[PDB]
Amino acid sequence: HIFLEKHLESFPKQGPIRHFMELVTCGLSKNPYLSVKQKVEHIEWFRNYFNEKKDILKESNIQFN
Amino acid sequence: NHHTYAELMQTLRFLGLYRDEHQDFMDEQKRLKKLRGKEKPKKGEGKRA
Amino acid sequence: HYVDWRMWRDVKRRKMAYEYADERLRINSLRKNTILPKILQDVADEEIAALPRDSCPVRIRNRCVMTSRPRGVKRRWRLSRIVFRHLADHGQLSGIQRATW
Amino acid sequence: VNRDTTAVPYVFQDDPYLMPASSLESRSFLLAKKSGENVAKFIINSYPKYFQKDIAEPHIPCLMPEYFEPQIKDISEAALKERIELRKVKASVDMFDQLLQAGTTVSLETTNSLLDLLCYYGDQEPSTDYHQFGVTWRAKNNAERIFSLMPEKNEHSYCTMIRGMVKHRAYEQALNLYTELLNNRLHADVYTFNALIEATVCAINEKFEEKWSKILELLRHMVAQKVKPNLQTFNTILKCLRRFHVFARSPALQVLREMKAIGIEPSLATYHHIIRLFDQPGDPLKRSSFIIYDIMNELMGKRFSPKDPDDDKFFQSAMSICSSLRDLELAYQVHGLLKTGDNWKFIGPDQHRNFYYSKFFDLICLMEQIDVTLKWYEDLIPSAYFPHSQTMIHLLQALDVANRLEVIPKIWKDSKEYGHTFRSDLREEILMLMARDKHPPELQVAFADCAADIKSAYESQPIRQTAQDWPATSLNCIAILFLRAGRTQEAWKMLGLFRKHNKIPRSELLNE
Amino acid sequence: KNRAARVRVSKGDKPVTYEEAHAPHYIAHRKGWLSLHTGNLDGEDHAAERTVEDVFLRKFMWGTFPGCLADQLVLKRRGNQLEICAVVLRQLSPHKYYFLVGYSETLLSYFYKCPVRLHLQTVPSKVVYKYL
Amino acid sequence: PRRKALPPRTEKMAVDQDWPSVYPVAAPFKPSAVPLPVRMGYPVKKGVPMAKEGNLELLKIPNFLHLTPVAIKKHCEALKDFCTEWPAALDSDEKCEKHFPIEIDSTDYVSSGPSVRNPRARVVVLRVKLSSLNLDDHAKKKLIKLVGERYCKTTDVLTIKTDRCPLRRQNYDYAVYLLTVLYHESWNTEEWEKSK
Amino acid sequence: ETYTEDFIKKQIEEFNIGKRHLANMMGEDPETFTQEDIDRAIAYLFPSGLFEKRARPVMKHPEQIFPAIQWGEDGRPFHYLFYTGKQSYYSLMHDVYGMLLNLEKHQVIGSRWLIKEELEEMLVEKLSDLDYMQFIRLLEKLLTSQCGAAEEEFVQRFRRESKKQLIEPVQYDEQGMAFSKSEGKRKTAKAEAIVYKHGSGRIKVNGIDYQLYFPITQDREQLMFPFHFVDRLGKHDVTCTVSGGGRSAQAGAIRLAMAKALCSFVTEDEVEWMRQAGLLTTDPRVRERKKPGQEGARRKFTWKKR
Amino acid sequence: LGISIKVHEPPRKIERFTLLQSVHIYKKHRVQYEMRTLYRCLELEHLTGSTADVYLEYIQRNLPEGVAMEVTKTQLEQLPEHIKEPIW
Amino acid sequence: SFFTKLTADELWKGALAETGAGAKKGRGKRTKKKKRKDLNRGQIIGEGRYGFLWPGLNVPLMKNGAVQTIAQRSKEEQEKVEADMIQQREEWDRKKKKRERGWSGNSWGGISLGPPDPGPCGETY
RNA sequence: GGACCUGGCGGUGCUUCAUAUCCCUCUAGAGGAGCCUGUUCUGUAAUCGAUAAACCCCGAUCAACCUCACCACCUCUUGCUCAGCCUAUAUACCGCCAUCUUCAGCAAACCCUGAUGAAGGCUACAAAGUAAGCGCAAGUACCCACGUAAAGACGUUAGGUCAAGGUGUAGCCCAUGAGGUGGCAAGAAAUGGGCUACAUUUUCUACCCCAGAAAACUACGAUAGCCCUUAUGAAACUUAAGGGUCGAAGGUGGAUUUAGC
Ligand SMILES: [K+]
Ligand SMILES: [K+]
Ligand SMILES: [K+]
Ligand SMILES: [K+]
Ligand SMILES: [K+]
Ligand SMILES: [K+]
Ligand SMILES: [K+]
Ligand SMILES: [K+]
Ligand SMILES: [Mg+2]
Ligand SMILES: [Mg+2]
Ligand SMILES: [Mg+2]
Ligand SMILES: [Mg+2]
Ligand SMILES: [Mg+2]
Ligand SMILES: [Mg+2]
Ligand SMILES: [Mg+2]
Ligand SMILES: [Mg+2]
Ligand SMILES: [Mg+2]
Ligand SMILES: [Mg+2]
Ligand SMILES: [Mg+2]
Ligand SMILES: [Mg+2]
Ligand SMILES: [Mg+2]
Ligand SMILES: [Mg+2]
Ligand SMILES: [Mg+2]
Ligand SMILES: [Mg+2]
């Protein structure tokens, strides 16, 4: 529940996305109302979401996978 | 869930195990209006056309 | 078998707000920051506004559960002042008594 | 905490109006409460959607609607196993042909699970909430049809067929089916051998000597197939031998002497079938007396666990044998063995329980001092059982013998609270006893207060089909109890009823 | 003038009960409460769900025991258990009472997922406190 | 004809009986079981309190007829086989903090209803003095700077409160994990600690 | 509801039997089971929190719970004044008027006249206000006359806390100094004051010199008042600790505490002067609550006469 | 059972709230209701797990209707092995 | 809904309008007074439209010495019970729905009031 | 038409009076200014209800959408519901209240008077009234005995509310029902209540009561306007907060009037 940065290995190591996904995992680590299965869902949703905005993320110089 | 409460006690009244005094009241008032002529019309075949 | 249509609309509203709760949360998170580019935040502003209006939680109204009264409702019992007093005046609400001091 | 001697069984409502008075109400008040739980489950399984909502934490699986209707509506091998766990005999047998007709391979473990459901119920549907004599093993039954179709048959196949025939009184055919099992170089199990001993004797009503030789052959085959007997195997032999009351006496003991050697602790049932066999309607009962004494010492100071269904019957049997022997020292051991641990649950159903206490309280009154007999009457009744007329009359013959005729105005108040208010035989033995002899004023005025309550009962009666009838003796006694007491005024108003109903008055009433 | 839970004065032929003879300002001075749970205590929750159960239970018993209820129900909760205590008339036969006890106990136990027990106290006639 | 109610069993009751057997467990007031002429209610002008028969005021009361002194003493005599003896060595509280310097807090809530859940049961508080830990000058100074307001200088007690995880066994393991990283991080001297 | 003697006689037997049952429940001895234990056992077995004590379960003797025919079978009333309607009241006026005639022939604090409501219990007769006054006028007339010994007993039947401060026990500290401790209350302020027998007039409030703690002179004047009145300023050392309230509520609470603790080091006569000066009384004036329909405690919202 | 126990009574809490008296208009006329919560703290000391288990079950089961409970348990633990000495 | 349902006493009290401003000062005609009817008079516990026979409540618990099981009336048999119930209702109503006039038809004068009420002390007229 | 009864009224008499009250008398206010808010007029395609005392920050312990009932356009038809209706009637009602009540009277059942008329019914050194029940009172709550709450009848005003909900009667049923999208709820004017002020007993700062500055066209004084940002939210010139700019009227208020021991 508290160490959720094992799941960010398919994300950029440095950048805005990492800084954004280090806030999602800090808030999800402070959440006693979700299970671990539900917390990964959130993380997997952004991964699928940033894979579909690759063209928009190239304009802003972000190399997501 | 008003459905569950309203459907359970409707079934229990038809099975005879719950006596609703409110429906009886309005079952008798609707029975006394058929004798007085004030019966609900058939849909489509209304007073207007 | 709800009190009225006004109550029935809220029931649907509350059901549609529970289905899109997570989707709306994930999309707002992008908007509620100064980290991501405006280009991406502008695309999320169009995605959360295209969802059904009834998924928005600001349309949910806390009505009474017996008489569907929109105002004069007590949140702890989800009852209107009129229905609360009726049960309280008959000694049916544990602990509730009239105050004198 | 112990039992409340002043209250009825907890299951009943603690309220004078809802308290069961008689023994008929006791059984009829629990059947109407069980009818409300069946009428509620009916409604809980017919309309589950109302009760599907679950607000309990932790989840209560026993407060959720059951779902009997099958779900898999296709035709596969896994859709049949779902209709066999729901005991859908008709659907499974009709859905098996379609599956078999298609030609899909059917495992041997799935066709043996269908025979079990057909061989057990005998191709008949189980009882449902809503939609003895003779043989229930029809010749045109699915159990035999599906048996032939099967291309391969293992041990379990026959084993579950022989047991299905004996259960539905098809004894004769099971023995014919057991010869085939021997022809296929197979080996039966213990359960299959258990039913073969029941069928053997039951099949033909031959003399015991021939039957004994026959039974020994199965047991010798049981030891030739590396089969180990269990408790039920011996229990059937004793149950089967019941018919040959006398002759079986000594042989039955042999069965009990082989259960110890091979380490098989006899249960309550094993002893229940011996005493019934030995027990016979004979005046001497010399043999029966010794048997029960030895059995009780062995059982003495033991705690029991359920093993065979017949275990419950033992307690009723022992008390009956004790009342026939008129021995109270042996009834205190049987009732003392019912109190240890939790053996009090083997007493039996309501019918068995009342019979046990009746025979028990009837041997206490007759045999022991009248001071303790009134302590057993306050404990058992009504908390344990409601009495039958013969028990109140048995108690009245003890007070008479114990010159304690001052409790009769208390025995009549209780009778009215136990449903014997209008029992002719009860009122005909209470009045005569009170009026038999003259008693001091203080005691003579109390009997008159019971005759004024017993007289009201005759005036008002529940059954109005026939005209009110007053027994000759009652009227003869109610009037003489008024005179002696001092109620002369009322003694002269009863004179008209003597000739009105043509009831002959005794000389002792006129002389006085 | 105030009207709530007050029985107006009459010639004297109207019989009222103790609970029916006292107004709301006596609910904690001369009367108790007909339902007793912890929902309304400081720091307790689920006060709105225990309330809906009470409103329905009082109606379920009023329509399931028609003409048999002398006085209002006294609902008691101890943990999972729910205890319904009632005063009933003796007009109805006992056979029918036992049926209604097993039907209501069982039905309400599967509906509110909790052990429900009902304790009847029959009375000959409606206890009368005074005649207003 | 019309059924007639039986007389109450109170009359049968003896003065020298066993009351616990009548009221073994909690039950509502049964006037036919309680052999007491107890009345309740506010009397009318020139009147007396209402009798127990049909009294709805005596049914509202949560009685303690099942918890009479004779019973409690009888109940607890049978419950002495479940209890364990407290180590005699631990006389006072100063001696308990020498062998057991860590105190764990955990709360259980009992409320009426069908659900027993409560989110307040997950909170775990861990208290431990810094004098019972093998700390030096540097470690103790650094450990007080990481915990912030969790350490009270007046009592020299570090309080760790964990409510992050749903279960109380996870928050207890997390509080013991925080104490270890803070202890092993207080002894580790970095290269940026020279600019103090 | 009329209760005869036979009904009350059956209630006497049920209480005695119920009194032996309640002693078996609690495990006491039936013989020495008083009525105070019954009140204690019924409050444990039947716990009621009703504010009215007359609405709670009670198991008393039938002579204290329940509150007769005035003619025989023939129908003649026993008393000769039956037809008056108030035979008990008029028999008393006839007796009192008969004792006032004999006197002619041969010739206080702590007590109050029986109230009207208490006089209807001795006679079991409803009485008007005016009739009660008439009876009192005859009794007073009886007292003025030279009544005999017997008459005094008759009048006594109809007839039914020193205002001194409670001195605190002087204690002694480790060093041996004598002092007295007391407590005060003013509005929401509570104060504890320790007054040493011998001192140099030093006061410390919460560990701070009083002039520093109380800048406003008025507050200091309140502190002086007790000592100035007993003309002993600069003779005791005070150490007080006040908590709650505000500036002026704390002084008043200390004044009262010092004054109460200074009564142990003064004579009885001086303590009565302090009482008559209002230094030992607790001011009961506290803030009044606001009402739902008004702007304030007593202020009302503007009346729209317009 | 041989347990040390101390009893005190924490100050009560009274929650009040006001409501309109009439169904319609008449704002100046309202009704006030309150809920009174009374406390009672039983502080036992020097128990064991087994002793607390049976005692709590016994009193918890007999807890009367309308009465909640909050059991706060202070457990004694020992320093973990890792905390005994630093990992040089 | 099911929570917006009152009791019979509350429904008739509002329908009859017996206590109101109109009654107080001759403001209401008596030409067509509304009349209270008991809708529970001829109702048996356990009888419903589906025609289910509940052992121990609707019908005898035991038949021929054996306990009955849950059964449901057939359409033909349940249709005869509803129609026979109506007949009892009409008969009861019909009976509820002759006088000797005095000097005039609507005149009170000349009408008999019977004998005076008996006195308490054994007096009769 | 004559003579009585009751009740109401009287620019009817007399007497005792109101104890925060009728008037004078004490204190702070209102009415004058600006703002906030409600109402009425007007306006708009665009709700309803309350509306002398007893309406007017009243239902609402609350309207950006929702709430919503309104308007315009489009759509559906056994329709979430063994339908539905915020359709009319509060002058059919229950229910919950207001008011006189900062009262004590209300009243069954009897009795008597008046020739057995409607009607009426007391005198304490007593002359026809007795009275359950109701209310008052007493008890209770809060910090007591005080005080404040609460309680406060029977009636009155066909008082208020069918739009809390329910409901009798009459009415609609391809529409007087149901759903969707967008939208209005403004201000020439008048008025009620409130907030802030007109300052020096004040303004600002420090402190929380021993201080230093300010002080009339850069003073006192807007919670208004304008601009920006932020918060909530899907959505804000729009709601709220804050900052910046701005620096108005106003200079202590006529007749009249409110509250408070
Ligand atoms: K006049
Ligand atoms: K103005
Ligand atoms: K009205
Ligand atoms: K309405
Ligand atoms: K209507
Ligand atoms: K203004
Ligand atoms: K300012
Ligand atoms: K002004
Ligand atoms: Mg934004
Ligand atoms: Mg909203
Ligand atoms: Mg003010
Ligand atoms: Mg009011
Ligand atoms: Mg005519
Ligand atoms: Mg308007
Ligand atoms: Mg709008
Ligand atoms: Mg009106
Ligand atoms: Mg009107
Ligand atoms: Mg008072
Ligand atoms: Mg008030
Ligand atoms: Mg009062
Ligand atoms: Mg419309
Ligand atoms: Mg719209
Ligand atoms: Mg500005
Ligand atoms: Mg300025």
UniProtKB/Swiss-Prot annotation, chain C:
Keyword Nucleotide-binding: no
Highest taxon of the lineage: Eukaryota
Keywords: Disease variant, Mitochondrion, Primary mitochondrial disease, Ribonucleoprotein, Ribosomal protein
GO CC, alphabetical: mitochondrial inner membrane; mitochondrial ribosome; mitochondrial small ribosomal subunit; mitochondrion; nuclear membrane
Gene Ontology BP annotations: mitochondrial translation; translation
Primary localization class, coarse: mitochondrion
Subcellular locations according to the entry: Mitochondrion
Gene Ontology molecular function: any one: RNA binding
Protein family per UniProt: Belongs to the universal ribosomal protein uS14 family.
Oligomeric and partner information: Component of the mitochondrial small ribosomal subunit (mt-SSU). Mature mammalian 55S mitochondrial ribosomes consist of a small (28S) and a large (39S) subunit. The 28S small subunit contains a 12S ribosomal RNA (12S mt-rRNA) and 30 different proteins. The 39S large subunit contains a 16S rRNA (16S mt-rRNA), a copy of mitochondrial valine transfer RNA (mt-tRNA(Val)), which plays an integral structural role, and 52 different proteins. Interacts with LIAT1.
Disease linked to the protein: Combined oxidative phosphorylation deficiency 38: An autosomal recessive disorder due to mitochondrial dysfunction and characterized by perinatal hypertrophic cardiomyopathy, growth retardation, muscle hypotonia, elevated lactate, dysmorphy and intellectual disability.
Protein's name in the database: Small ribosomal subunit protein uS14m
First-to-last residue of the parent protein present: 28 to 128 of 128
From Swiss-Prot, chain E:
GO annotation, biological process: mitochondrial translation
Alphabetical keyword list: Mitochondrion, Ribonucleoprotein, Ribosomal protein, Transit peptide
GO cellular component assignments: mitochondrial inner membrane; mitochondrial small ribosomal subunit; mitochondrion
Coiled coil: none
Primary location recorded for the protein, binned into one broad class: mitochondrion
Top-rank taxon: Eukaryota
Subcellular location: Mitochondrion
GO molecular function: RNA binding; structural constituent of ribosome
Subunit (UniProt): Component of the mitochondrial small ribosomal subunit (mt-SSU). Mature mammalian 55S mitochondrial ribosomes consist of a small (28S) and a large (39S) subunit. The 28S small subunit contains a 12S ribosomal RNA (12S mt-rRNA) and 30 different proteins. The 39S large subunit contains a 16S rRNA (16S mt-rRNA), a copy of mitochondrial valine transfer RNA (mt-tRNA(Val)), which plays an integral structural role, and 52 different proteins.
Membership in a protein family: Belongs to the universal ribosomal protein uS3 family.
Record-given protein name: Small ribosomal subunit protein uS3m
Whole-protein residues included: 36 to 167 of 167
UniProtKB/Swiss-Prot annotation, chain G:
GO molecular function: RNA binding; structural constituent of ribosome
GO biological process: mitochondrial translation
Domain of life: Eukaryota
Keywords noted in UniProt: Acetylation, Mitochondrion, Ribonucleoprotein, Ribosomal protein, Transit peptide
Gene Ontology CC: one annotated term: mitochondrial small ribosomal subunit
Leader sequence residues: none
Region feature (Disordered): 284-306
Family recorded in the similarity comment: Belongs to the universal ribosomal protein uS9 family.
Subunit structure: Component of the mitochondrial small ribosomal subunit (mt-SSU). Mature mammalian 55S mitochondrial ribosomes consist of a small (28S) and a large (39S) subunit. The 28S small subunit contains a 12S ribosomal RNA (12S mt-rRNA) and 30 different proteins. The 39S large subunit contains a 16S rRNA (16S mt-rRNA), a copy of mitochondrial valine transfer RNA (mt-tRNA(Val)), which plays an integral structural role, and 52 different proteins.
Name the record gives this protein: Small ribosomal subunit protein uS9m
Covered residues, full protein: 67 to 396 of 396
From Swiss-Prot, chain H:
An example Gene Ontology biological process: mitochondrial translation
Main location: mitochondrion
GO CC, alphabetical: mitochondrial inner membrane; mitochondrial matrix; mitochondrial small ribosomal subunit; mitochondrion
Top-level taxon in the UniProt lineage: Eukaryota
Protein localization: Mitochondrion
Keywords: Mitochondrion, Ribonucleoprotein, Ribosomal protein
Subunit comment: Component of the mitochondrial small ribosomal subunit (mt-SSU). Mature mammalian 55S mitochondrial ribosomes consist of a small (28S) and a large (39S) subunit. The 28S small subunit contains a 12S ribosomal RNA (12S mt-rRNA) and 30 different proteins. The 39S large subunit contains a 16S rRNA (16S mt-rRNA), a copy of mitochondrial valine transfer RNA (mt-tRNA(Val)), which plays an integral structural role, and 52 different proteins.
Annotated family: Belongs to the universal ribosomal protein uS10 family.
Full protein name: Small ribosomal subunit protein uS10m
Full-length numbering of the shown residues: 102 to 189 of 201
